[PDB]
C-alpha cells in the first residue's frame, strides 16, 4: 500500500515539496463575482468570505511574528490559518464546517466538483441550450410518421433569425432593427414568411 | 479598543470606515432603545433629532448598513437550485445588438460614401470613426492643407446635405 | 495554452509554489473588495484592478486612458494594464503565506 | 414650453434667463451649463458626464474649468452662501431647492 | 340536512350518523385558542382537565419566571399575559401588506431580594400575529398557513434486534427526550449490556449504577434473577462510586482534569437538571404511562427522576429475559413489549400552537440571557423592568418562524377545497422531522393505527409520497398532541349513543367493530361473528357479545377532500388517491354548477371553507346588492356584509362572491348568504355536468386524451378568470429618483394611446405581450455613446434623451384587460421600505377559454389533455338529437381499476332524467331497502351518495330500469345502461350501443398557456455562459447527460458538438452563429467552450497544476 504511492512519487519528476503548501493561489474575480442585485442588495459567491478569512489570518500571523509574541499565540494563529486553508479547499472535511448567516455551510472549491451540483455533472456533461422550448403534447392522429405538430408561437420564437433574414430578404422590413419589432409585434406578414 | 477596531475594520464584507460604523451603531442603539420607550418604530425624521442631522443622512446610513447576500443559498422551499442560477450577466453580449451595430456601421459607410470623399474623410476624422480619436479642426486642416474656417464650412455642408430626407429616412429607421 | 482546438494531451500534476507564483499576476495583501461609496475595487484587494486587470474595456483605475488606441501598455500611475475585461476571467492571483 | 425651476426661468427661443424676474445676460457655455442643469433638474450630474455632453469630446484640458464655471453661475444667480445649486464632493453638481 | 340553507340532497344512506362532523378547522382554531388563553378555550378546559388550566404563553412565562442573578439578591418575574385589539381589520391589513397582529403586554415583576422592592411595570412585548377566523395568518399582506407536523413523541422506545449470528433476539432502548442527551441501553453480541451514553460505545451498567451513589449490595439486591446483569456486575473491574464517577467523566468530558466534585455535579447537571435536559410534559406523561410510575399525580418536574433509569433498566432486562408483565416497586404493573415507532400512539402532532410556543420560547431564552447579563452589570436600585427587557429577540424569532420556514408556507387558494386541505393536513418534514432522503420505506407506509386517525388516501404523489398527509374528518387533537378519534361503545349486543374519544394506543385494549354493521334497532347484530379490528391490526371475526366498541359511522377513515368522491368503494386506492389530489387543483369557473351526483360532505366543506359568507345572526334582509348586503336583525341593529369581487387569489384565480338571497326573504343564523368561487347554493361545485360517451373516437381520444364540444367554448361552460398582479418599485438611486411619467424616450403613439398622463394604464385598456405598462423613467447615466449615435442625431434632430426607459413591459404569453391600480407613494405617507419612494401594483385579467392542451379530470382520477375541440356537428348524438358533450376512451377504464366512474355516469344520467318506480303491485325487491322519497324524482334533480354507505348495484339497476323520458316518448338509455348514437360525420348509426351519462368534470390548474415556452437567445449566467432556467426568465431547455447518451448512441457527433458548444457556451461562437443566420452565410466551426476553461481555472486555482499539451 505504501509502495503504490511512493513508487509513483519516485518515477515522476514531481517533488513532494508541493504536496505541502507555502503559497495559495487566488481564483479570478469573475468566477467569484459580486453582482449588485437590483435594489441595492449585493450578492457574492461565498468564496470571497473564505478568502477574506485566510487573508485576515495571514495578516494577523505576520503582525504577531514580526511584533514578538508568546509562542502559544503564534502557534494558535498558525492553527487557525491551517483551519482556514482547509475550509477554503474543502469545507467540512474535518471538524465542524464553517458556516455564515442562517447556519448553513459555505461552498469551498472542492464543493464545486462533487455530486450532481458539481461543475462536471451539471455544467459540462449536460448544459442548457438555446433555440429550444417545452410544451404539452396532444395526439396527432391525422399526421404522418415523419410529421409532428408545432405551436405557431413556439415556431415563431424558435425560428427567429431565420424569419428575420427571410422577411428582410422579402423586403418585409428594410432593416433588421425594424425586423425586431416586425416579428415581436406579430404582425400578420410574419406567418406566411415563417411557414 | 482592539476588539472594536477589528470589528469595525475587518468583520464586514464591504469595508466601512470606523467613523461611519460608529454612527451606524449609535443609530441602531437609539432606535432599539426608543422602540421600548415608544412601542412603535420611529420614522427617521424623529431619530434625525437625536442624531442632530438631516433625515436624508439617516436614510443613507440605513441603506449603507445592509450587507451582501450569498449566491449559493437555496432560494427554493425544497432544495434543488441556487440563487446564482437566476442572475443575468449584464456584461454578456446580447448578440443581437452587436449584429445590428455591424449592419449599422455598414449603413453608415454606405451613406457617407454618397457624400464627397473629402467630406467623408472630414466627418470620419471629426468623430473618430477610422480611429477612436476625434480630431480638432486644425488636425483636419493640416491633413488637408486648409484653414480651420474652411473645415467649418465643410462641416456645415456635411450636416446640411446629410439632413436631406433620403439619408434621413434610411438612417432613422435603424433605432 | 492558446486554445485553437488542437489538443493531444491533458497533463495534470502537483502544483509547487513556483508554478502558482508563475501563474499569479500579483500578490493579494488586503481583505477589501469594494468601496462602500464609489463601488469600485480597492488597491491590492480581492478584486484588485491592477492585479486581475481592468473592469471596463480599455480603462484604467484612475481614468488616465479610456480609448482603444492604448493597447497592452500599462498605466504608469495606477498600474492597470489596458485590455479587454475577459482578463478578469483569465488572470489569477496568489497569497504569500507567512 | 419654457423651462422653470423654483425662481429660475428659461427661454430657449432667444436665449435669456429669469431669476425671479430681473434681467440678466450670461455667457454662452455657462448658459449651456444652466440648460443642462435645468433639463436634468431632479437628476444629479457627474462632472465627466458634463464635460462629455455639453462640452466637446476633444476637451484635453484639466477639470478645474467646470468648478470655475459653476462658481460663475453661483455668483450670478445663487448669491447667498446657501444655494439652490448644490455640490456633491466627487459626484458633480445638481440643482436642488433646499429642504 | 339540519342546515338552514341546505338544498334538499336526497341520499342513499342506509344508517344515521350518531353525530355530525365537527368544525373542520378545529385542529388550528382550538390550538390557537389554547395558546392565547381566550375564554373560549378557558370554558372548554374547565371540563377537560381543569386541574391545571394554563395557556401556552402562560405556561412558558411561568416556566421562565423567576429569573435570578448570580448571587440571589436580585430577581425578576413575568405574569398576566394580556392582549389588545388588532391594529387594523383583516381586509385593510391585507390591502396595505402589513402583518395582521395585536399588541402583547405582560406585567413584569422586579423584586429586590436583599431589601424588598416591587416594580409592576407593564412592558410592551410586541405585535403578536393573530389567527383569523378562517385559520390563516396574514404576514406582509399575504395569506400564510402553519401546517401541523408529525414527530417522534419524546419518551422511551424499547426495540428488538437480531444479531444474525446465533439467532439471538437482542434488545435495545432509546430514551429520546427533547432538548436533552440521548441514553442507549442494549445487549451486545455477547451476554453483556451496552449502556452507551452520548454515543460512547463503552461503559456497562456497573459504572452508571455505582455512579448513582449505589453500591454493589443494592445492585445484587435488585438484580438476582438477571443472568445478563449479574455477570456484568462480576466483571465490573471498577469499584467505588468515586471511581465510577471519574471513569464516566473521563469517557464523557475529556480534556479537562477531573476532581472529586466535577463528575458528581456533572451527572446531576446532565440528566437531573432542567437547564440542559428536559423532556416535555407530554414526554413525562408518556414515560409515566409506559413504565407505570405515576398514575394519579399532577404532571410536574419535567427533569428525569432516579426511578426512571432503574425502571428502564429493569424493563429492558425483563424483555430480554422474555417476560410479559413488569412491576416496579412503588408503581402499577405494565405490560412488557417492544415499542413500535410508526404507531400513532408514539407519534405526536406539533400543531401551530406548539410551534409558535417553541419559537416564542427560544426568543424568551435569548432575551432572558440578555436580561441576566444586564442584571448584574447595571447598578442596583436604579433598575426598572424596562431596562432589562429587550423585546428584539422575541419579535425576531416569531418573524423568522413565520417567514422562511417550510412549516409555514403559502396558503394555496385555487379553490375552497385547496384552502380547506391546506389546513387539517399533516406533514413529516421540517425542523426536528425527517427529510425525503432520510425517509425510509417504513415511514411512507400506512400503519394500521392510522385507521380513523389519518386518512390513507390524501397524499402527494410525487417524491413526498407517504410523508405529507391529511387529517380525517372525525379526528380530534388530544390536549397532549396525540391524534384522537371518537367511537361508539357497545355492551352485551347493545350500542349506546355515548360517544367516547380514544387515542391510538387506547384502541389496543379494546375491540372496535365494523362501521356498517347489521344493527337491529337495538344494538344486537344478526350474526355473532362480525368483522372487527383487533389490537395489532389483525381483522378477524368476533362474536357479538365479545365486541365492546363500534365505529361512529362510515367515512371515518377518510379525509374531507377524498370524501367527495362518489362510489369510492368501487375505485382502486391508486386512482382514488389521484382523484383526491386533483380535487385540490380545480379552478373556479364563472358559473360553478352544483354536481348532479355528490356526497353529503360538500355542503359542510363549502360552509366551513370560510370563503362563503354565513349569516352569523338571523333576521330579515333589509337590502341586497352586488357590492354589499345589509341584513336587518331581529333586534333593532343591522349588519352589513362587504363583498369581495374579482379578488386576486394566491394562485392567480378569481374570487368572485355573488349573493344568493332576495330583497325580503327572512334568513336564519348559520345560513349561506353569498356563494364562494367554487360554490352554488352553498355547496361545493368544482366543475360541471357533461354528457359522456365512453367509446373511442378516431383516435383523437387515444391514450387518455379527451375531445370536447365547441359548445363549451361558445356557451362559456368551461372558462375561468385569471387575475395577474405586476409590481414596480421606484426606489432611490445616485441617479436621483424614478418618476412615474409619460416622458419615455423614443416611443410611438398607438402603443401610448391606452396609457394615462399619470404614468399608468387607463383602467379598462387591453394590453398584450411587450406593451408598455408603467412608465418609470430613470436617468440613463453615461457610457460610451457610439459615434454612430452622434452622426445619427444630426439627421433627424433627435435630442440626447439622457434617461433610460426602465418601464414595465408585459411579459410573453399573457394578455387581457386591466382591473385597477393600487398606487403607493412616500408623498402619500405610507410605510414603504427604506429608499423605496413609490410602489405601484397593476392587475391584469383575462377570460381563459377552454382549448386543446388544457388538462381535464373527473373525480375518479381519469386525467388527460384536450385532444381536439371539434364542432357540434362532428359528435355522436342520441335519438333525441342532443349532441354529446364529452368523449372518453374505453381502454382506460378496465386497465386502471376505476370502475366507479361509469357507475357515477349511470347515476348522473338517472338524476338528469328522473325516475318513478312503479310501486303499485308491491314495492320492488331492490327498492325495499332503498329509502323513501327516492322512488320518485324530478328531472335534473340532485342526489347524494356517501363514500362507503351508498347506492348498491341492484339499486342502480332498478333506477336504470325506470328512466321516464324528457318531453316525448323516448327511452334513450336502455335497461343495461348503453344507448344508441348516430355518427355526426358519416351519419349512419353506430353498429353497437354506447353508454351515455353525466359525469362531473373540472378544469385543472395546469393550463397550456402557463406551460408553453420558447427561447431563441436570452440571458446567460455569471459564472458560466450557459442560459438560465425557468419561464420567469427567458429560460432555455436543459440538455441533460442522459440525452447526451442518446445523442452518442445515434452517433450524431456534429449535432451534440453544436448543442454543447455554440447553442450553450461559446460566446464568440454564439455571436458568430447569430451573424451567420442573419447574413445567410454558412454556419462556422464551433470554438472552445467557456465552461471548460472555467473548470480548468478552478482546477488551476485549487492548487492542481493542470496543463493542456498540444503535442
Ligand atoms: Zn491609470
UniProtKB/TrEMBL annotation, chain B:
<comment type="similarity">
    <text>Belongs to the sigma-70 factor family. RpoD/SigA subfamily.</text>
</comment>
<feature type="DNA-binding region" description="H-T-H motif">
    <location>
        <begin position="137"/>
        <end position="156"/>
    </location>
</feature>
<feature type="region of interest" description="Sigma-70 factor domain-3">
    <location>
        <begin position="22"/>
        <end position="98"/>
    </location>
</feature>
<feature type="region of interest" description="Sigma-70 factor domain-4">
    <location>
        <begin position="111"/>
        <end position="164"/>
    </location>
</feature>
<comment type="function">
    <text>Sigma factors are initiation factors that promote the attachment of RNA polymerase to specific initiation sites and are then released. This sigma factor is the primary sigma factor during exponential growth.</text>
</comment>
<feature type="domain" description="RNA polymerase sigma-70">
    <location>
        <begin position="136"/>
        <end position="162"/>
    </location>
</feature>
<comment type="subunit">
    <text>Interacts transiently with the RNA polymerase catalytic core.</text>
</comment>
<protein>
    <recommendedName>
        <fullName>RNA polymerase sigma factor SigA</fullName>
    </recommendedName>
</protein>
Automatic annotation (TrEMBL), chain D:
<feature type="DNA-binding region" description="OmpR/PhoB-type">
    <location>
        <begin position="1"/>
        <end position="97"/>
    </location>
</feature>
<protein>
    <submittedName>
        <fullName>DNA-binding response regulator</fullName>
    </submittedName>
</protein>
<feature type="domain" description="OmpR/PhoB-type">
    <location>
        <begin position="1"/>
        <end position="97"/>
    </location>
</feature>
